[PDB]
Amino acid sequence: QNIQEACLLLDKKQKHIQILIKGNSSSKSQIRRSSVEAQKYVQDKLLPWPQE
């Protein structure tokens, strides 16, 4: 029973690992997107004010 329980535990852990992997890949893409959004805001909304 212990061996079986342990096997389940290993499987759960394995799932978490798979989630974290995906999670970290997504976070990386998000960081790139978030960076592009802040730059776009400065270019489209702030830089045009000195001329006005």
């Binding site: 909304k45 702030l46 004010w49 006005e52």
Partner: protein
């Protein structure tokens, strides 16, 4: 920063608009000094016509 700059532009714009309105008013021909009386009697001068 965007909100603050926006307020300054609005204040300058309102002041600018009000100035243009006043200049337009002061440039009215009827307010401008003693144009040499008109040689012709104005239609509104009923006394001279009479």
């Amino acid at each position: 920063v965007y909100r603050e700059l926006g307020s300054i532009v609005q204040e300058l714009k309102e002041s600018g608009d009000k100035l243009e309105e006043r200049l337009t008013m002061l440039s009215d021909v009827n307010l401008l000094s003693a144009s040499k009386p008109r040689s012709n009697i104005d239609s509104k001068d009923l006394t001279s016509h009479r």
